[PDB]
Design a protein around this nucleic acid. Structure first.
Ligand SMILES: [Mg+2]
Ligand SMILES: [Mg+2]
Ligand SMILES: [Mg+2]
Ligand SMILES: [Mg+2]
Ligand SMILES: [Mg+2]
Ligand SMILES: [Mg+2]
Ligand SMILES: [Mg+2]
Ligand SMILES: [Mg+2]
Ligand SMILES: [Mg+2]
Ligand SMILES: [Mg+2]
Ligand SMILES: [Mg+2]
Ligand SMILES: [Mg+2]
Ligand SMILES: [Mg+2]
Ligand SMILES: [Mg+2]
Ligand SMILES: [Mg+2]
Ligand SMILES: [Mg+2]
Ligand SMILES: [Mg+2]
Ligand SMILES: [Mg+2]
Ligand SMILES: [Mg+2]
Ligand SMILES: [Mg+2]
Ligand SMILES: [Mg+2]
Ligand SMILES: [Mg+2]
Ligand SMILES: [Mg+2]
Ligand SMILES: [Mg+2]
Ligand SMILES: [Mg+2]
Ligand SMILES: [Mg+2]
Ligand SMILES: [Mg+2]
Ligand SMILES: [Mg+2]
Ligand SMILES: [Mg+2]
Ligand SMILES: [Mg+2]
Ligand SMILES: [Mg+2]
Ligand SMILES: [Mg+2]
Ligand SMILES: [Mg+2]
Ligand SMILES: [Mg+2]
Ligand SMILES: [Mg+2]
Ligand SMILES: [Mg+2]
Ligand SMILES: [Mg+2]
Ligand SMILES: [Mg+2]
Ligand SMILES: [Mg+2]
Ligand SMILES: [Mg+2]
Ligand SMILES: [Mg+2]
Ligand SMILES: [Mg+2]
Ligand SMILES: [Mg+2]
Ligand SMILES: [Mg+2]
Ligand SMILES: [Mg+2]
Ligand SMILES: [Mg+2]
Ligand SMILES: [Mg+2]
Ligand SMILES: [Mg+2]
Ligand SMILES: [Mg+2]
Ligand SMILES: [Mg+2]
Ligand SMILES: [Mg+2]
Ligand SMILES: [Mg+2]
Ligand SMILES: [Mg+2]
Ligand SMILES: [Mg+2]
Ligand SMILES: [Mg+2]
Ligand SMILES: [Mg+2]
Ligand SMILES: [Mg+2]
Ligand SMILES: [Mg+2]
Ligand SMILES: [Mg+2]
Ligand SMILES: [Mg+2]
Ligand SMILES: [Mg+2]
Ligand SMILES: [Mg+2]
Ligand SMILES: [Mg+2]
Ligand SMILES: [Mg+2]
Ligand SMILES: [Mg+2]
Ligand SMILES: [Mg+2]
Ligand SMILES: [Mg+2]
Ligand SMILES: [Mg+2]
Ligand SMILES: [Mg+2]
Ligand SMILES: [Mg+2]
Ligand SMILES: [Mg+2]
Ligand SMILES: [Mg+2]
Ligand SMILES: [Mg+2]
Ligand SMILES: [Mg+2]
Ligand SMILES: [Mg+2]
Ligand SMILES: [Mg+2]
Ligand SMILES: [Mg+2]
Ligand SMILES: [Mg+2]
Ligand SMILES: [Mg+2]
Ligand SMILES: [Mg+2]
Ligand SMILES: [Mg+2]
Ligand SMILES: [Mg+2]
Ligand SMILES: [Mg+2]
Ligand SMILES: [Mg+2]
Ligand SMILES: [Mg+2]
Ligand SMILES: [Mg+2]
Ligand SMILES: [Mg+2]
Ligand SMILES: [Mg+2]
Ligand SMILES: [Mg+2]
Ligand SMILES: [Mg+2]
Ligand SMILES: [Mg+2]
Ligand SMILES: [Mg+2]
Ligand SMILES: [Mg+2]
Ligand SMILES: [Mg+2]
Ligand SMILES: [Mg+2]
Ligand SMILES: [Mg+2]
Ligand SMILES: [Mg+2]
Ligand SMILES: [Mg+2]
Ligand SMILES: [Mg+2]
Ligand SMILES: [Mg+2]
Ligand SMILES: [Mg+2]
Ligand SMILES: [Mg+2]
Ligand SMILES: [Mg+2]
Ligand SMILES: [Mg+2]
Ligand SMILES: [Mg+2]
Ligand SMILES: [Mg+2]
Ligand SMILES: [Mg+2]
Ligand SMILES: [Mg+2]
Ligand SMILES: [Mg+2]
Ligand SMILES: [Mg+2]
Ligand SMILES: [Mg+2]
Ligand SMILES: [Mg+2]
Ligand SMILES: [Mg+2]
Ligand SMILES: [Mg+2]
Ligand SMILES: [Mg+2]
Ligand SMILES: [Mg+2]
Ligand SMILES: [Mg+2]
Ligand SMILES: [Mg+2]
Ligand SMILES: [Mg+2]
Ligand SMILES: [Mg+2]
Ligand SMILES: [Mg+2]
Ligand SMILES: [Mg+2]
Ligand SMILES: [Mg+2]
Ligand SMILES: [Mg+2]
Ligand SMILES: [Mg+2]
Ligand SMILES: [Mg+2]
Ligand SMILES: [Mg+2]
Ligand SMILES: [Mg+2]
Ligand SMILES: [Mg+2]
Ligand SMILES: [Mg+2]
Ligand SMILES: [Mg+2]
Ligand SMILES: [Mg+2]
Ligand SMILES: [Mg+2]
Ligand SMILES: [Mg+2]
Ligand SMILES: [Mg+2]
Ligand SMILES: [Mg+2]
Ligand SMILES: [Mg+2]
Ligand SMILES: [Mg+2]
Ligand SMILES: [Mg+2]
Ligand SMILES: [Mg+2]
Ligand SMILES: [Mg+2]
Ligand SMILES: [Mg+2]
Ligand SMILES: [Mg+2]
Ligand SMILES: [Mg+2]
Ligand SMILES: [Mg+2]
Ligand SMILES: [Mg+2]
Ligand SMILES: [Mg+2]
Ligand SMILES: [Mg+2]
Ligand SMILES: [Mg+2]
Ligand SMILES: [Mg+2]
Ligand SMILES: [Mg+2]
Ligand SMILES: [Mg+2]
Ligand SMILES: [Mg+2]
Ligand SMILES: [Mg+2]
Ligand SMILES: [Mg+2]
Ligand SMILES: [Mg+2]
Ligand SMILES: [Mg+2]
Ligand SMILES: [Mg+2]
Ligand SMILES: [Mg+2]
Ligand SMILES: [Mg+2]
Ligand SMILES: [Mg+2]
Ligand SMILES: [Mg+2]
Ligand SMILES: [Mg+2]
Ligand SMILES: [Mg+2]
Ligand SMILES: [Mg+2]
Ligand SMILES: [Mg+2]
Ligand SMILES: [Mg+2]
Ligand SMILES: [Mg+2]
Ligand SMILES: [Mg+2]
Ligand SMILES: [Mg+2]
Ligand SMILES: [Mg+2]
Ligand SMILES: [Mg+2]
Ligand SMILES: [Mg+2]
Ligand SMILES: [Mg+2]
Ligand SMILES: [Mg+2]
Ligand SMILES: [Mg+2]
Ligand SMILES: [Mg+2]
Ligand SMILES: [Mg+2]
Ligand SMILES: [Mg+2]
Ligand SMILES: [Mg+2]
Ligand SMILES: [Mg+2]
Ligand SMILES: [Mg+2]
Ligand SMILES: [Mg+2]
Ligand SMILES: [Mg+2]
Ligand SMILES: [Mg+2]
Ligand SMILES: [Mg+2]
Ligand SMILES: [Mg+2]
Ligand SMILES: [Mg+2]
Ligand SMILES: [Mg+2]
Ligand SMILES: [Mg+2]
Ligand SMILES: [Mg+2]
Ligand SMILES: [Mg+2]
Ligand SMILES: [Mg+2]
Ligand SMILES: [Mg+2]
Ligand SMILES: [Mg+2]
Ligand SMILES: [Mg+2]
Ligand SMILES: [Mg+2]
Ligand SMILES: [Mg+2]
Ligand SMILES: [Mg+2]
Ligand SMILES: [Mg+2]
Ligand SMILES: [Mg+2]
Ligand SMILES: [Mg+2]
Ligand SMILES: [Mg+2]
Ligand SMILES: [Mg+2]
Ligand SMILES: [Mg+2]
Ligand SMILES: [Mg+2]
Ligand SMILES: [Mg+2]
Ligand SMILES: [Mg+2]
Ligand SMILES: [Mg+2]
Ligand SMILES: [Mg+2]
Ligand SMILES: [Mg+2]
Ligand SMILES: [Mg+2]
Ligand SMILES: [Mg+2]
Ligand SMILES: [Mg+2]
Ligand SMILES: [Mg+2]
Ligand SMILES: [Mg+2]
Ligand SMILES: [Mg+2]
Ligand SMILES: [Mg+2]
Ligand SMILES: [Mg+2]
Ligand SMILES: [Mg+2]
Ligand SMILES: [Mg+2]
Ligand SMILES: [Mg+2]
Ligand SMILES: [Mg+2]
Ligand SMILES: [Mg+2]
Ligand SMILES: [Mg+2]
Ligand SMILES: [Mg+2]
Ligand SMILES: [Mg+2]
Ligand SMILES: [Mg+2]
Ligand SMILES: [Mg+2]
Ligand SMILES: [Mg+2]
Ligand SMILES: [Mg+2]
Ligand SMILES: [Mg+2]
Ligand SMILES: [Mg+2]
Ligand SMILES: [Mg+2]
Ligand SMILES: [Mg+2]
Ligand SMILES: [Mg+2]
Ligand SMILES: [Mg+2]
Ligand SMILES: [Mg+2]
Ligand SMILES: [Mg+2]
Ligand SMILES: [Mg+2]
Ligand SMILES: [Mg+2]
Ligand SMILES: [Mg+2]
Ligand SMILES: [Mg+2]
Ligand SMILES: [Mg+2]
Ligand SMILES: [Mg+2]
Ligand SMILES: [Mg+2]
Ligand SMILES: [Mg+2]
Ligand SMILES: [Mg+2]
Ligand SMILES: [Mg+2]
Ligand SMILES: [Mg+2]
Ligand SMILES: [Mg+2]
Ligand SMILES: [Mg+2]
Ligand SMILES: [Mg+2]
Ligand SMILES: [Mg+2]
Ligand SMILES: [Mg+2]
Ligand SMILES: [Mg+2]
Ligand SMILES: [Mg+2]
Ligand SMILES: [Mg+2]
Ligand SMILES: [Mg+2]
Ligand SMILES: [Mg+2]
Ligand SMILES: [Mg+2]
Ligand SMILES: [Mg+2]
Ligand SMILES: [Mg+2]
Ligand SMILES: [Mg+2]
Ligand SMILES: [Mg+2]
Ligand SMILES: [Mg+2]
Ligand SMILES: [Mg+2]
Ligand SMILES: [Mg+2]
Ligand SMILES: [Mg+2]
Ligand SMILES: [Mg+2]
Ligand SMILES: [Mg+2]
Ligand SMILES: [Mg+2]
Ligand SMILES: [Mg+2]
Ligand SMILES: [Mg+2]
Ligand SMILES: [Mg+2]
Ligand SMILES: [Mg+2]
Ligand SMILES: [Mg+2]
Ligand SMILES: [Mg+2]
Ligand SMILES: [Mg+2]
Ligand SMILES: [Mg+2]
Ligand SMILES: [Mg+2]
Ligand SMILES: [Mg+2]
Ligand SMILES: [Mg+2]
Ligand SMILES: [Mg+2]
Ligand SMILES: [Mg+2]
Ligand SMILES: [Mg+2]
Ligand SMILES: [Mg+2]
Ligand SMILES: [Mg+2]
Ligand SMILES: [Mg+2]
Ligand SMILES: [Mg+2]
Ligand SMILES: [Mg+2]
Ligand SMILES: [Mg+2]
Ligand SMILES: [Mg+2]
Ligand SMILES: [Mg+2]
Ligand SMILES: [Mg+2]
Ligand SMILES: [Mg+2]
Ligand SMILES: [Mg+2]
Ligand SMILES: [Mg+2]
Lengths: 122, 138
RNA sequence: AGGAACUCUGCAAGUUGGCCCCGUAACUUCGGGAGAAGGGGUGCUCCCUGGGGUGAUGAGCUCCGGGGAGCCGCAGUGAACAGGCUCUGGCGACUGUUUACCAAAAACACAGCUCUCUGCGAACUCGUAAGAGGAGGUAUAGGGAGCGACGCUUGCCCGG
RNA sequence: AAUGUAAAAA
RNA sequence: CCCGGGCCUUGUACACACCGCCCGUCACGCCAUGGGAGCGGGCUCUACCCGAAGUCGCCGGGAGCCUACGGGCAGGCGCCGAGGGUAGGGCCCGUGACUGGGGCGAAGUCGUAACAAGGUAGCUGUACCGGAAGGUGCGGCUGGA
RNA sequence: CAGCUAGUUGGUGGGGUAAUGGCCCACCAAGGCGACGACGGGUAGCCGGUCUGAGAGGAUGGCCGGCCACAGGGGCACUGAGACACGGGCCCCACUCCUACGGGAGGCAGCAGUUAGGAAUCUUCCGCAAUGGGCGCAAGCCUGACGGAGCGACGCCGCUUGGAGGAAGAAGCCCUUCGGGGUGUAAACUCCUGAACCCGGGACGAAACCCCCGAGGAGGGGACUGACGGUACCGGGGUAAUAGCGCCGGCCAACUCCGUGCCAGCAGCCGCGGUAAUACGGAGGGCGCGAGCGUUACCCGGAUUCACUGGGCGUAAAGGGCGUGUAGGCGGCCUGGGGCGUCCCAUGUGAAAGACCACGGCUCAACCGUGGGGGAGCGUGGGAUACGCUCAGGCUAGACGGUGGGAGAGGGUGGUGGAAUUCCCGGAGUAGCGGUGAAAUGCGCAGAUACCGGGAGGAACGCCGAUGGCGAAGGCAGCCACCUGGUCCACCCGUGACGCUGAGGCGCGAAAGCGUGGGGAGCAAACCGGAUUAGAUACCCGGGUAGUCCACGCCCUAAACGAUGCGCGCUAGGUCUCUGGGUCUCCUGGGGGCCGAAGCUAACGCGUUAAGCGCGCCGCCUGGGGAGUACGGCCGCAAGGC
């Protein structure tokens, strides 16, 4: 455009938008498990994933992934929410956090225990 | 109606050089002169001189060029490689001396209007004056 | 005291009621809906002040009014005349018409749409007839029929 | 003169 | 002409390459969303009724107290007033039987509109019409010959 | 969110105040504000600064400092230099508590501590010794300001877990072509050093107020007080004394083995796993960092992906359907005054802190002190006048105008001609016609088709006709007359910069469609029948209504396409054609085409009819889908449009 057109209308600011209504854009949010379930993956893959629908402190109710092999979540597990989607699963914008509240750590994992809430083996 | 007589002149010179004319004329005007005068003095053009087309004051501008080149396209290197108006009519540019541009790390020139007169970028600093940044040339 | 609990039904009755001021929704064919709704004023005294008619330009008389200060009672359109409001369905566009004496309506009628007959000694109606109406009109007219403001629309079937 | 899904390219 | 093949050229939305691709309906599931008799909530606006404290103005009289008596304080009233109440509008959010379409989903039903004259060139505004893609009419465009 | 406004705008006088003022009141006048964004909604304390960034920019306001605002919610005033007053007062609301029911007490957004909420955020410490504040002549009193210590890898910074030697190389473990290779100088072992711990010493921060002389002053002189703390630091003694995390398919530095088998799982993007995975998981080994390493969240970067610096719009997302034009934007050549913009100089200001430089302080460093420099920006003064502006004066190159001519399906109105179709009347004539891929429906002995004559009627204009002309687009074609728009050429006669563009506005705007009335030949959605097919709501055939035609009105969309906004200047030519001027195989102008200089382009391609080189102005774009959909608003009879 001309300069003058800029002096009028002007440049519209990008204004981006979120990927996670964990509300308050907090780093994590607590919640209780509403339902522990296992769901089929998407277009190119397959393998029933371990997931749970959690009711938030923020009055919400989101679905969240349970990472790692084997878990202990049940229809009343309080748990910590982490946020991070999953290409494989339709609308799942949050990870559960292994090793906090009623969510155990991955049993017997030796590699990268930090990401799977697992204490140091003696 | 012709918007900017200056951009025009500059352009006339650019459009002519590219085809390697000997001299393109231009509608005469006192302020237009200085641009040439300096533009020539610095060595960008063999020179200029008032003329007359069918009763119209104009200015012959004798273009300079480099020597012939060897090899494919013996295109003679230019003497004016670059020329461009800075302050336009739709956007006047004004600079303080404490902030005048250095064209092509000094190889280039930046003619500009000022209270003391039309001066090179260097002559600007010389007499320590700022003004309307007209255009740069290299 | 209660406030529809009555009862087919708020049937009857009560509420509201005039005027001045403020204020007033959806929807709407832009006119309406509206008096929507909801509220305020309303008497008497004293004082200052605007405009009009008569006349003379004024006085008196008379018409409409504006402002200030005060009085009394439970109460000021102090008695009489005097809308209860709102929301939302059905039918019918609408004002009208009707079963004189058990039915006023969703029934008829209506402007408007369509079909059809009729070329003038018209078709159609009354009359055995003469005749008359139609009309001292002439297809943008006249008779018959159905539908019935307005908006959108009104499909297929011609065997009987 | 119709249609042939769904896992193959260091 | 049927089948297989070679060279040139042309079209393509095809490229493990026409046993290619590919469209819309319907059927199933998930998801977000619009409408919807309404229902519930927040913020706000207008008009009115009630109105504390308090300043300010008048009185302080048929009464109180101080009084250097001239006045002062208490008390009386009035205006404003937080806020309450009433009625009526505006914006916004949540919720609702049902309903519209939309996105996604290794497989379903229907047909095959488009991509090659895609076997009626296609595409388009619009109008009618039909299970569905679509078809047809009028014009218009080549992104057709 | 497009209009808002009654103390609303202004005045006169009056109250009130430290004081100006509709701050408040009485009267008067009708005004004030708004696309340069009023009014409305959503959000938010603001700055010094902080963060990122090459910068321009973006984002942000924690701690420190400055200003504003509040003290459970709201209103009020009292005292006073000052308050509408956090730890004062009155009232209403909510909440807490006390009560002998009449009443009464309270406000941690001060320091601590509690609880609730939350992903999460500290000790009910010490001291007035310093500094600072209030009162006091003074002694001194108060000081959860403050100086300090305590808790948390929350951050930055310094440091430790040891230093040298130590095998052709222990065992263990992993790999292997079964020779060997790796962890690896790593270990053990050897000597050395000595965090921790231990004993002795032990601060600076503190001189003044005070008292003596000098006067009680100047000046000299004397003494008291340390919370941190027996801590920092110095001296002596002295033990080998925590290592973790992320990753190793590609981006991306780090490779093998087993297990596993679209499962278990991974995932930031691309993708990886379906028996043999450097991509899952374990192991051996490796890369990266280390009292940390990873994750999640948000900001700036990359992102020249909102482009001022620094982008675009023929086909990729994007030129408005087209014109007239308001506002605004932009503005040819000469001279003069002013000096607004602009440039320069001088000074004021731009606090401190911070940023950068230098040097010093604590063993270094972080942190800290001192000093230095510049800084955008605004205020005052002075100066320059080229460009911009502005007043004034002149010009003719832009634009407009006179006069004379030209081509043209440009628009409107009235009339008019022929050809064919159709129906009807007449004649003559008979056995089929028609239609298709083929055929049927259909028409036809009630005499069709084919042919001649006559009549009615409606629509469209063959050849000329084009690679053609006109128009702003949409579009415009027999002929004739009238009314009228645009444009081109010659003369260089007139005006004297009157120009260009154009948000909104207004006008035009194929076709289809809508209203009322008309008209209706041919054609033809829908509709019916025939045929094709698995089916055929279609293509083909027979029939056939609205419509197509006119008037008046409405609708306003499109592949309204060159898919290319307009105006001007500049940048080789070759050829074809329409139109004008000139004594002319030539030239000069305006138009429509093709091929091409240079150049532009992602390529195709464009190329004096630019998509090249430049300036002005408007419109538009900013991943595909959802969608030109939804809500709202506006317009419309409706369809529906913006
Ligand atoms: Mg799957
Ligand atoms: Mg389990
Ligand atoms: Mg379990
Ligand atoms: Mg275990
Ligand atoms: Mg991993
Ligand atoms: Mg040369
Ligand atoms: Mg020289
Ligand atoms: Mg009651
Ligand atoms: Mg009963
Ligand atoms: Mg009943
Ligand atoms: Mg009564
Ligand atoms: Mg009453
Ligand atoms: Mg009554
Ligand atoms: Mg009554
Ligand atoms: Mg009145
Ligand atoms: Mg209502
Ligand atoms: Mg009314
Ligand atoms: Mg009503
Ligand atoms: Mg009603
Ligand atoms: Mg009224
Ligand atoms: Mg009503
Ligand atoms: Mg009301
Ligand atoms: Mg009323
Ligand atoms: Mg009353
Ligand atoms: Mg009264
Ligand atoms: Mg009385
Ligand atoms: Mg009086
Ligand atoms: Mg009188
Ligand atoms: Mg009289
Ligand atoms: Mg008289
Ligand atoms: Mg008189
Ligand atoms: Mg008088
Ligand atoms: Mg009188
Ligand atoms: Mg009353
Ligand atoms: Mg009364
Ligand atoms: Mg009465
Ligand atoms: Mg009354
Ligand atoms: Mg009455
Ligand atoms: Mg009444
Ligand atoms: Mg009522
Ligand atoms: Mg009703
Ligand atoms: Mg009726
Ligand atoms: Mg009806
Ligand atoms: Mg009546
Ligand atoms: Mg009657
Ligand atoms: Mg009757
Ligand atoms: Mg009667
Ligand atoms: Mg009777
Ligand atoms: Mg009877
Ligand atoms: Mg009645
Ligand atoms: Mg009746
Ligand atoms: Mg009638
Ligand atoms: Mg009707
Ligand atoms: Mg008839
Ligand atoms: Mg009879
Ligand atoms: Mg008879
Ligand atoms: Mg008669
Ligand atoms: Mg008669
Ligand atoms: Mg009739
Ligand atoms: Mg319809
Ligand atoms: Mg019917
Ligand atoms: Mg049917
Ligand atoms: Mg029948
Ligand atoms: Mg029949
Ligand atoms: Mg029959
Ligand atoms: Mg099929
Ligand atoms: Mg299939
Ligand atoms: Mg396939
Ligand atoms: Mg062959
Ligand atoms: Mg061959
Ligand atoms: Mg081929
Ligand atoms: Mg094609
Ligand atoms: Mg190809
Ligand atoms: Mg492909
Ligand atoms: Mg196929
Ligand atoms: Mg394929
Ligand atoms: Mg179901
Ligand atoms: Mg819904
Ligand atoms: Mg809803
Ligand atoms: Mg509400
Ligand atoms: Mg009252
Ligand atoms: Mg009071
Ligand atoms: Mg007052
Ligand atoms: Mg007294
Ligand atoms: Mg006294
Ligand atoms: Mg006394
Ligand atoms: Mg007294
Ligand atoms: Mg006194
Ligand atoms: Mg009192
Ligand atoms: Mg009151
Ligand atoms: Mg009030
Ligand atoms: Mg109130
Ligand atoms: Mg209330
Ligand atoms: Mg009431
Ligand atoms: Mg309300
Ligand atoms: Mg709702
Ligand atoms: Mg739904
Ligand atoms: Mg749809
Ligand atoms: Mg659907
Ligand atoms: Mg649905
Ligand atoms: Mg779809
Ligand atoms: Mg499916
Ligand atoms: Mg099936
Ligand atoms: Mg399907
Ligand atoms: Mg299928
Ligand atoms: Mg097809
Ligand atoms: Mg086909
Ligand atoms: Mg095709
Ligand atoms: Mg079409
Ligand atoms: Mg069907
Ligand atoms: Mg067509
Ligand atoms: Mg066209
Ligand atoms: Mg095409
Ligand atoms: Mg061909
Ligand atoms: Mg008023
Ligand atoms: Mg005054
Ligand atoms: Mg004061
Ligand atoms: Mg005011
Ligand atoms: Mg005043
Ligand atoms: Mg007043
Ligand atoms: Mg605002
Ligand atoms: Mg901010
Ligand atoms: Mg600053
Ligand atoms: Mg800033
Ligand atoms: Mg700044
Ligand atoms: Mg930086
Ligand atoms: Mg910055
Ligand atoms: Mg930025
Ligand atoms: Mg702050
Ligand atoms: Mg913050
Ligand atoms: Mg803070
Ligand atoms: Mg602090
Ligand atoms: Mg803090
Ligand atoms: Mg601060
Ligand atoms: Mg200030
Ligand atoms: Mg407050
Ligand atoms: Mg308060
Ligand atoms: Mg509090
Ligand atoms: Mg309070
Ligand atoms: Mg305050
Ligand atoms: Mg205080
Ligand atoms: Mg207070
Ligand atoms: Mg306190
Ligand atoms: Mg207590
Ligand atoms: Mg007692
Ligand atoms: Mg207490
Ligand atoms: Mg308090
Ligand atoms: Mg408090
Ligand atoms: Mg505290
Ligand atoms: Mg605490
Ligand atoms: Mg807690
Ligand atoms: Mg602390
Ligand atoms: Mg102290
Ligand atoms: Mg003490
Ligand atoms: Mg402190
Ligand atoms: Mg601790
Ligand atoms: Mg941590
Ligand atoms: Mg922490
Ligand atoms: Mg060693
Ligand atoms: Mg070795
Ligand atoms: Mg070995
Ligand atoms: Mg040794
Ligand atoms: Mg030793
Ligand atoms: Mg220790
Ligand atoms: Mg000492
Ligand atoms: Mg000392
Ligand atoms: Mg000391
Ligand atoms: Mg000392
Ligand atoms: Mg002492
Ligand atoms: Mg002495
Ligand atoms: Mg002495
Ligand atoms: Mg002394
Ligand atoms: Mg001394
Ligand atoms: Mg001393
Ligand atoms: Mg001590
Ligand atoms: Mg010590
Ligand atoms: Mg000790
Ligand atoms: Mg000691
Ligand atoms: Mg010691
Ligand atoms: Mg120590
Ligand atoms: Mg020592
Ligand atoms: Mg020591
Ligand atoms: Mg030592
Ligand atoms: Mg050791
Ligand atoms: Mg050792
Ligand atoms: Mg890493
Ligand atoms: Mg890296
Ligand atoms: Mg690598
Ligand atoms: Mg398994
Ligand atoms: Mg196996
Ligand atoms: Mg393997
Ligand atoms: Mg494999
Ligand atoms: Mg990886
Ligand atoms: Mg691995
Ligand atoms: Mg390892
Ligand atoms: Mg460190
Ligand atoms: Mg970014
Ligand atoms: Mg960005
Ligand atoms: Mg950027
Ligand atoms: Mg771009
Ligand atoms: Mg352009
Ligand atoms: Mg887009
Ligand atoms: Mg335009
Ligand atoms: Mg336009
Ligand atoms: Mg377009
Ligand atoms: Mg338009
Ligand atoms: Mg124009
Ligand atoms: Mg203008
Ligand atoms: Mg100028
Ligand atoms: Mg200007
Ligand atoms: Mg000028
Ligand atoms: Mg001048
Ligand atoms: Mg001046
Ligand atoms: Mg200066
Ligand atoms: Mg600054
Ligand atoms: Mg300065
Ligand atoms: Mg300074
Ligand atoms: Mg500073
Ligand atoms: Mg910085
Ligand atoms: Mg120094
Ligand atoms: Mg140092
Ligand atoms: Mg040391
Ligand atoms: Mg400094
Ligand atoms: Mg400094
Ligand atoms: Mg600076
Ligand atoms: Mg400076
Ligand atoms: Mg300035
Ligand atoms: Mg001058
Ligand atoms: Mg003049
Ligand atoms: Mg002039
Ligand atoms: Mg001229
Ligand atoms: Mg003509
Ligand atoms: Mg014509
Ligand atoms: Mg004509
Ligand atoms: Mg006429
Ligand atoms: Mg004829
Ligand atoms: Mg006859
Ligand atoms: Mg015949
Ligand atoms: Mg004949
Ligand atoms: Mg004939
Ligand atoms: Mg004849
Ligand atoms: Mg023509
Ligand atoms: Mg043309
Ligand atoms: Mg004629
Ligand atoms: Mg003409
Ligand atoms: Mg003359
Ligand atoms: Mg002249
Ligand atoms: Mg001018
Ligand atoms: Mg039209
Ligand atoms: Mg039409
Ligand atoms: Mg229709
Ligand atoms: Mg029509
Ligand atoms: Mg109609
Ligand atoms: Mg009619
Ligand atoms: Mg009609
Ligand atoms: Mg017909
Ligand atoms: Mg036909
Ligand atoms: Mg049909
Ligand atoms: Mg058919
Ligand atoms: Mg069959
Ligand atoms: Mg059939
Ligand atoms: Mg047909
Ligand atoms: Mg006609
Ligand atoms: Mg007509
Ligand atoms: Mg007519
Ligand atoms: Mg334009
Ligand atoms: Mg023009
Ligand atoms: Mg000629
Ligand atoms: Mg000549
Ligand atoms: Mg000649
Ligand atoms: Mg001539
Ligand atoms: Mg010749
Ligand atoms: Mg020739
Ligand atoms: Mg020539
Ligand atoms: Mg010519
Ligand atoms: Mg030409
Ligand atoms: Mg030509
Ligand atoms: Mg070309
Ligand atoms: Mg080339
Ligand atoms: Mg040209
Ligand atoms: Mg040219
Ligand atoms: Mg050319
Ligand atoms: Mg051009
Ligand atoms: Mg281009
Ligand atoms: Mg291009
Ligand atoms: Mg997008
Ligand atoms: Mg998107
Ligand atoms: Mg999108
Ligand atoms: Mg779209
Ligand atoms: Mg899109
Ligand atoms: Mg549309
Ligand atoms: Mg729409
Ligand atoms: Mg909306
Ligand atoms: Mg909505
Ligand atoms: Mg809408
Ligand atoms: Mg309407
Ligand atoms: Mg209609
Ligand atoms: Mg449009």
């Amino acid at each position: 455009p001309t300069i003058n057109q800029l002096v009028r209308k002007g440049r519209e600011k990008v204004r981006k938008k979120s990927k996670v209504p964990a509300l308050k854009g907090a780093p994590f949010r607590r919640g209780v498990c509403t339902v522990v379930r296992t769901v089929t993956p998407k277009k190119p893959n397959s393998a029933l994933r371990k997931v749970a629908k959690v009711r938030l402190t923020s009055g919400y109710e989101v679905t969240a992934y349970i990472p790692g092999e084997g878990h202990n979540l049940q229809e009343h597990s309080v748990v910590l929410i982490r946020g991070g989607r999953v290409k494989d699963l339709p609308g799942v914008r949050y990870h559960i956090v292994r090793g906090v509240y009623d969510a155990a750590g991955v049993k017997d994992r030796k590699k990268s225990r930090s990401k799977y809430g697992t204490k140091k083996p003696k | 109606m012709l918007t900017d007589p200056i951009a025009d002149m500059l352009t006339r010179i650019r459009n002519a050089t590219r085809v390697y004319k000997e001299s393109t004329d231009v509608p005469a005007s006192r302020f237009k002169e200085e641009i040439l005068r300096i533009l020539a003095r610095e060595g960008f053009i063999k020179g200029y001189e008032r003329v007359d087309v069918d009763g119209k004051p104009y200015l012959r501008v004798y273009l300079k060029y480099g020597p012939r080149r060897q090899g494919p396209d013996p295109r003679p290197e230019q003497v004016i490689h670059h020329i461009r108006r800075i302050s336009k009519p739709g956007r006047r540019v004004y600079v303080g001396v404490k902030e005048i541009p250095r064209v092509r790390r000094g190889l280039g020139i930046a003619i500009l209007s000022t209270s003391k007169g039309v001066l090179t970028d260097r002559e600007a600093r010389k007499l320590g004056v700022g003004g309307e940044l007209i255009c740069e040339v290299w």
